[PDB]
């Protein structure tokens, strides 16, 4: 049971899928490197920054209480109990920054509302959450799948892929996300071959089973994927053991993760995956790359991350091979900033700018946490929060790109996605940006390298 406790004048809860969903009786598996450890640090970074900042919450140091969600909802839920219990050693939570998988953001939202705690997700995208009548204390800095589904169908409708198959992760994410695609699919005259869907505690046999059925309709060479990062790997893994080949069209769930195609660099070749529109946070880069087990002591998971990333081994381990070189480090050769890290940082600044207004509004005299705010008014903070608008943490170069954080009447973000193509040119697999989606598709077509190096056909 590892957590992160940094005391402060005001505290923010944190939820990150630091560890993958553990198989069997256990709950937490291997370290999620890029979407777990990075995103986590990103929050620490953002806090660090908000504390070093003078024009945003100065007399109110921001403390954090971060918990791993081990990619499982029921688990994060239990963890989250930590925050509501913290309203009565206990940390007075102001807002929770969290919910990577939609699956857990919801399960968590269902509890924070009962205790009026503002939640902000930096990645959950299920349209289900937009419903501000069931998730009245939730907000996120990313747009719902209702706008990604469109982006997806409009990609097939452009390549006359009238007959394609769908397979979606079980769970509020994949489900709602596909039900979104299903609709947008019919409307553009696209018939769905076989409707596949994986699930929980699933092993190889259930994934191969899905591959089989994707093969029982060999007319549809284009398979649409609305699956979680994990279920999206197990699928490709299966599809590879039996040299099965298709034109993969996947939701951000797969996104541009090069860690999904690892071990099947080809069975996934010439695929098309979408991701959210984001511009890397310069400072975070230098920040993360500056980390190492000798200076990152506040992150209890760092060691395990270190040993796993470098194939290391140490005394604070079990019993393995190859000890680890001191001159080992995170550099530009072993690290690429995760796509959503931007959303993490904005999520936090939001919460902060939100509090920051409450500060100056409720307490004119000082810069410190007065008596007015000794005990926050959740409801208030949340309807003094949505109404937020600010220039993305200055960690952003431009300003003219609507790079300002704010929320809709639903508390969600702007639907800007990037279209990707999985290609390899020099013995190495990489993702190349080939168009995007603003409200209408776009892509330099003659940029795409397809499987069987030919523009596919699915009718």
Ligand X SMILES: N[C@@]1(C(=O)O)CN[C@@H](C(=O)O)C1
What end-to-end distance do the CA atoms of the chain give, in Å? 52
Options 60-68, 99-107, 382-390, 431-439: segment touching ligand X (CB under 6 A): 99-107
Options 84-92, 117-125, 241-249, 449-457: segment touching a second copy (CB under 8 A): 84-92
Choose the one of a second copy, ligand X, none that binds residue 111, judging by a C-beta under 5 to 8 angstroms depending on kind: a second copy
| 45, 59 Cβ separation under 8 angstroms | no
158 binds a second copy (CB under 8 A): no
Nearer to ligand X, 11 or 149 (CB): 149
- Residue 398, token pair as written in the block: 């431009």
Q: Which residue has the tokens 């997806």?
A: 152
| 284, 42 Cβ separation under 8 angstroms | yes
Q: Which residue has the tokens 């018939």?
A: 191
Nearest to 95 by CA among 47, 133, 33: 47
Taking the CA atoms of the chain, what radius of gyration do you get in angstroms?
Answer: 22
337 binds ligand X (CB under 6 A): no
35 binds ligand X (CB under 6 A): yes
Least distance from ligand X to the Cβ atom of residue 437, Å: 15
What are 226's strand-pairing partners?
Answer: 168
CB count within 10 Å of CB 278 equals 20
106 binds ligand X (CB under 6 A): no
CA 76 from centre of chain: 15
CA–CA separation, 284 vs 33, rounded Å?
16
CA–CA separation, 110 vs 135, rounded Å?
7
Choose the one of a second copy, ligand X, none that binds residue 71, judging by a C-beta under 5 to 8 angstroms depending on kind: none
3-state secondary structure of 200: coil
| 98, 108 Cβ separation under 8 angstroms | yes
Least distance from ligand X to the Cβ atom of residue 253, Å: 4
Choose the one of ligand X, a second copy, none that binds residue 191, judging by a C-beta under 5 to 8 angstroms depending on kind: none
Least distance from a second copy to the Cβ atom of residue 78, Å: 7
173 binds ligand X (CB under 6 A): yes
E strand spans, 99-246: 119-121, 138-140, 163-168, 191-196, 222-226
User: Where would I find the H helices in 53-92?
Assistant: 73-85
DSSP state letter for 427: S
Choose the one of ligand X, a second copy, none that binds residue 100, judging by a C-beta under 5 to 8 angstroms depending on kind: ligand X
Q: Which residue has the tokens 């704010």?
A: 406
Which of 7, 59, 81, 432 binds a second copy (CB under 8 A)? It is 81
CA–CA separation, 30 vs 106, rounded Å?
24
Choose the one of a second copy, ligand X, none that binds residue 340, judging by a C-beta under 5 to 8 angstroms depending on kind: ligand X
Choose the one of ligand X, a second copy, none that binds residue 130, judging by a C-beta under 5 to 8 angstroms depending on kind: none
Q: Is 121 annotated as a binding residue?
A: no
Choose the one of a second copy, ligand X, none that binds residue 115, judging by a C-beta under 5 to 8 angstroms depending on kind: a second copy
CA atoms 287, 288, 292, 298: torsion sign: positive
102 binds ligand X (CB under 6 A): yes
**What are the two backbone dihedrals, phi and then psi, of residue 168, each rounded to the nearest 5 degrees?**
-125, 140
89 binds a second copy (CB under 8 A): no
Least distance from ligand X to the Cβ atom of residue 121, Å: 7
| 127, 146 Cβ separation under 8 angstroms | yes
Contacts to ligand X from residues 220-239, by CB under 6 A: 228-229
Options 97-105, 109-117, 312-320, 371-379: segment touching ligand X (CB under 6 A): 97-105
Which of 53, 92, 115, 310 binds a second copy (CB under 8 A)? It is 115
- The mark string for 126-165 relative to ligand X (x by CB under 6 A, - otherwise) is x---------------------------------------
Mode of pairing for the β-strands spanning 389-391 and 10-16: unpaired
What are 63's strand-pairing partners?
Answer: 11
Least distance from a second copy to the Cβ atom of residue 11, Å: 19
Chain residues that interact with ligand X, rule: CB under 6 A: 35, 100-102, 123-126, 173, 228-229, 252-253, 340
Chain residues that interact with a second copy, rule: CB under 8 A: 77-78, 81, 84-85, 87-88, 107, 110-111, 113-115
Binding-site positions for L-glutamate read 39, 102, 123-125, 173, 252, 340
């Amino acid at each position: 049971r590892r957590e992160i406790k940094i005391e402060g004048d005001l505290v923010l809860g944190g939820l990150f899928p630091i560890n993958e969903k553990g198989t069997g009786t256990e709950e937490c598996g291997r370290i999620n490197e890029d979407r777990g450890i990075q995103r986590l640090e990103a929050m620490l970074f953002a806090i660090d920054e908000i504390n070093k900042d003078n024009y945003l919450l100065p007399g109110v140091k921001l403390g954090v209480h971060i918990l791993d969600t081990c990619s499982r909802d029921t688990y994060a839920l239990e963890q989250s109990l930590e925050f509501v219990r913290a309203s009565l050693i206990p940390l007075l939570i102001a807002g929770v920054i969290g919910g990577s998988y939609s699956s857990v953001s919801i399960q968590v939202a269902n509890l924070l509302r009962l205790f009026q705690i503002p939640q902000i997700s930096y990645a959950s995208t299920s349209a289900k959450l937009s419903d501000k009548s069931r998730y009245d204390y939730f907000a996120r800095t990313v747009p719902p799948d209702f706008y990604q589904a469109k982006a997806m169908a409009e990609i097939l409708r452009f390549f006359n892929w009238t007959y394609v198959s769908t397979v979606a992760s079980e769970g509020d994410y994949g489900e709602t996300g596909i039900e979104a695609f299903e609709q947008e699919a019919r409307l553009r005259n696209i018939c769905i071959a076989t409707a596949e869907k994986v699930g929980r505690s699933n092993i190889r046999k259930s994934y191969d089973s899905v591959i089989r059925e994707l093969l029982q309709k060999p007319n549809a060479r284009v398979v649409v994927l609305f699956m979680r990062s994990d279920d999206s790997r197990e699928l490709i893994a299966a599809a590879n053991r039996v040299n099965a080949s298709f034109t993969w069209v996947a939701s951000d769930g797969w996104g541009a993760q090069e860690s999904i195609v690892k071990g099947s660099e080809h069975v996934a070749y010439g695929a098309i995956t979408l991701e959210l529109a984001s511009h890397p946070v310069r400072q975070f880069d230098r920040y993360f790359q500056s980390l190492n087990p000798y200076n990152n002591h506040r992150n209890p998971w760092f060691r395990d991350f270190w040993e796993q990333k470098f194939q290391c081994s140490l005394q604070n381990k079990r019993n393995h091979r190859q000890v680890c070189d001191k001159h080992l480090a995170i550099d530009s050769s072993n690290y690429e900033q995760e796509s959503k890290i931007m959303f993490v940082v904005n999520a936090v600044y939001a919460m902060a700018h939100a509090l920051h207004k409450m500060q100056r509004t409720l307490c004119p005299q000082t810069t410190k946490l007065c008596d007015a705010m000794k005990i926050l008014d959740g409801k208030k903070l949340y309807k003094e929060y949505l109404l937020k608008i600010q220039f993305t943490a200055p960690f952003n170069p431009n300003k003219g790109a609507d790079s300002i954080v704010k929320f809709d009447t639903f508390g969600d973000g702007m639907g800007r996605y990037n279209v990707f193509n999985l290609q390899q040119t020099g013995g190495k697999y990489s993702y190349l940006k080939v168009g995007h989606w603003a409200e209408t598709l776009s892509l330099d077509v003659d940029s795409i390298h397809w499987s069987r190096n030919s523009v596919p056909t699915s009718q």
